[PDB]
């Protein structure tokens, strides 16, 4: 009753994320914040 090995259930794509250029700059801003003092 597990997901099928074949299809959208491919190790090749089970993992894929999406982004908006807005959320792209927002995450890099989190990286910028990493600079201490």
């Amino acid at each position: 009753g597990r997901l099928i090995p074949a299809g959208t259930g491919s190790d090749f794509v089970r993992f894929t994320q999406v982004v908006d250029q807005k959320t792209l700059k927002a995450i890099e801003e989190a990286r910028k914040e990493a600079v201490e003092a």
């Binding site: 099928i4 090995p5 074949a6 299809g7 959208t8 259930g9 491919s10 190790d11 090749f12 794509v13």
Partner: protein
């Protein structure tokens, strides 16, 4: 048992587009109950869920506002439809519901071919994709209007079925009426005038066998495209009539209907010239020409754009069919005048066989096998006879066109109505000595009937068997083949198979070009293992050979440049559990390369299980 399921009788949905399907609102309501409940709360119809529930617990209590809610919940969602035997992956297809009144389920006509479903009471089930994911896949890779080409063959499956062809065919056919006096206008100017007046008279038809132009061409010439049809509308030219017309840069001698078909496609897809390049207006559109058209349009213009063409054809085919007024009368089934001849000639010949046995020449057996040989030949004779009749005298015989056009009818079938069904076998298998002299047009006698009955049962008894033998098979195949799935990077093991374009033994030994089909089967959408330079073009290595390429190699083998072809294949793959992109090929239900993650194992096991239902079934071993 699925929780969000349903099932009703199905019914043809002519206006419906491949995209959608007609679903009884009454069904939709229960199906999408929870989706509705909540949506009721988002609107003023109900305060809460439990409320919204009791609100619908009785039929008389529903405010018309609820329908507007459900109709809103189903906006872009889609459902799955199933058929009785799910034989292949298309056995289930996704569509956008368009809610409708009543009990029946409106189904599209084009997909009636994928699911083997006719409307003599067939019933389809219906399921619902709940997750946003299940929906995503469902409407992306499971929706009908996307899977147009079969996984078995790169041939379309959205082919204009029965009625559509029948329509599209009748419109594009040309007529020929009476040849009495001279047919020579190619040369004299007195020929144009005399046979133009003689036609005005009663002697020359508008469509006479007169090489260059029958007077039907002489009389009417049409400047622009439209001009042509307008005359038709006014009752000047029928659609099936032979006339001359000016198109883009040519004076083309083609019929009204043909010219119109041209537009239909030209319109379906606005790249007009591209519409002309992939169409053959030199012939009546049979299912094959159409089939072809579809395929071409698919590779050429793009998937969705094809879909449009599909319904475009669907629509006009349907319409034109109605007006064509094709019907079925008893007299339309025409029996040849030659039937009596062929019969009697073979009749007396039977007498000789008898005299030859009465004397002691032919053994008990020799007699038998000689008689049957008489009929088997005589019967096939009447067959090509009836056709010739129609081919020559009634080109537009109802019963005929349907069979010519990809529409409906089998040569062997026609034979039984117009000509005669001649030999039926005894219970065991030994064919009967006496034939069935009758046709269905005339009274199949009390006994020639009984005689033919035997053979009927065996066919039915056989059909009853593949209903499950078909499974016997697919089962086994899927037991061994399920694990097989496309999961890769070009498998680096280049060990390849060579496809033969020639066969050693039809007649003992003579090398010959394989049938365009088999070869197609072998190299369509494959991946070249090694590079091959053939007629002038350099097929590179690893290139996926399109049907156009596999059309080249053949043309090349015809010339004598190649006897084999290097090509990757599953038989030589390295991925232990699985097969790769380059070794599988093209054919996803789509025509490009295979997409990683396709369940090939089964796709395969299925394509092979279905047709199995058509193969004979006497004894396994």
């Amino acid at each position: 048992r699925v929780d969000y399921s349903g099932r009703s009788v199905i019914v043809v949905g002519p206006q419906l587009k491949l995209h959608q399907c007609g679903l009884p609102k009454r069904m939709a309501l229960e199906l999408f109950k929870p989706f509705l409940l909540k949506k009721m709360e988002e609107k003023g119809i109900a305060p809460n869920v439990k409320a919204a529930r009791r609100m619908l617990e009785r039929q008389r209590d529903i405010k018309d506002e609820v329908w507007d809610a459900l109709e809103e919940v189903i906006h872009g969602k889609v459902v799955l439809l199933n058929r009785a035997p799910t034989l292949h992956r298309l056995g289930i297809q996704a569509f956008q519901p368009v809610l409708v009144e009543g009990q029946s389920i409106q189904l599209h006509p084009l997909v009636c071919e994928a699911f083997n479903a006719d409307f003599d009471g067939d019933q389809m089930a219906v399921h619902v994709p709940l997750s946003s994911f299940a929906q995503a896949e469902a409407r992306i890779q499971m929706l009908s209007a996307h899977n147009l080409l079969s996984p078995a063959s790169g041939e379309p499956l959205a082919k204009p079925s029965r009625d559509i062809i029948l329509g599209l065919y009748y419109i594009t056919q040309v007529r020929k009426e009476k040849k009495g006096a001279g047919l020579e206008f190619a040369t004299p100017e007195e020929a144009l005038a005399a046979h133009e007046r003689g036609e005005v008279a009663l002697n020359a038809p508008i469509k006479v066998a007169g090489r260059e132009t029958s007077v039907g061409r002489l009389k009417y010439v049409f400047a622009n495209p439209d001009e042509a049809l307008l005359a038709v509308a006014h009752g000047i030219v029928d659609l099936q009539d032979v006339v001359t017309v000016r198109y883009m840069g040519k004076r083309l001698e083609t019929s009204p209907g043909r010219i119109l078909f041209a537009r239909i496609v030209a319109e379906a897809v606005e790249d007009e010239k591209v519409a002309w390049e992939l169409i053959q207006l030199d012939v009546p559109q049979e299912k094959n020409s159409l089939k072809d058209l579809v395929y071409q349009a698919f590779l050429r213009l793009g998937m969705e754009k094809t879909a449009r063409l599909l319904d475009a054809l669907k629509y006009y085919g349907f319409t034109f069919s109605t007006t064509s007024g094709i019907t079925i009368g008893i007299d339309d089934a025409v029996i040849p005048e030659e039937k009596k001849q062929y019969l009697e000639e073979a009749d007396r010949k039977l007498l000789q066989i008898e005299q030859a046995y009465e004397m002691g020449f032919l053994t008990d057996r020799e007699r038998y096998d000689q008689i049957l040989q008489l009929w088997t030949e005589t019967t096939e004779k009447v067959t090509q006879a009836v056709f010739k009749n129609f081919e020559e005298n009634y080109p537009f015989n109802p019963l005929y066109v349907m069979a010519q056009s990809g529409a409906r009818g089998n040569p062997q079938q026609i034979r039984q109505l117009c000509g005669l069904r001649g030999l039926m076998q005894k219970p065991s298998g030994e064919t009967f000595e006496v034939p069935v002299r009758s046709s269905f047009r005339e009274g199949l006698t009390v006994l020639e009937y009984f005689i033919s009955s035997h053979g009927a049962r065996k066919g039915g008894a056989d059909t009853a068997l593949r209903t499950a033998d078909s499974g016997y098979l697919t089962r086994k195949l899927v037991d061994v083949t399920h694990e097989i799935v496309v999961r890769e990077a070009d498998c680096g093991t280049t060990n390849y198979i060579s496809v033969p374009l020639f066969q050693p033994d039809e007649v003992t030994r003579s090398l010959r070009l394989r049938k365009r089909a088999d070869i197609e089967a072998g190299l369509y959408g494959r991946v070249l293992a090694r590079e091959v330079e053939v007629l002038g073009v350099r097929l590179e290595e690893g290139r996926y050979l399109s049907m156009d390429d596999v059309h080249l190699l053949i043309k090349a083998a015809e010339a004598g440049e190649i006897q084999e072809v290097p090509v990757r294949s599953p038989l030589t793959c390295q991925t232990r559990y699985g097969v790769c992109q380059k070794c599988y090929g093209y054919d996803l239900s789509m025509a490009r390369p295979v997409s990683i993650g396709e369940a090939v194992g089964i796709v395969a096991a299925q394509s092979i299980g279905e047709p199995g239902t058509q193969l004979t079934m006497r004894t396994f071993h």
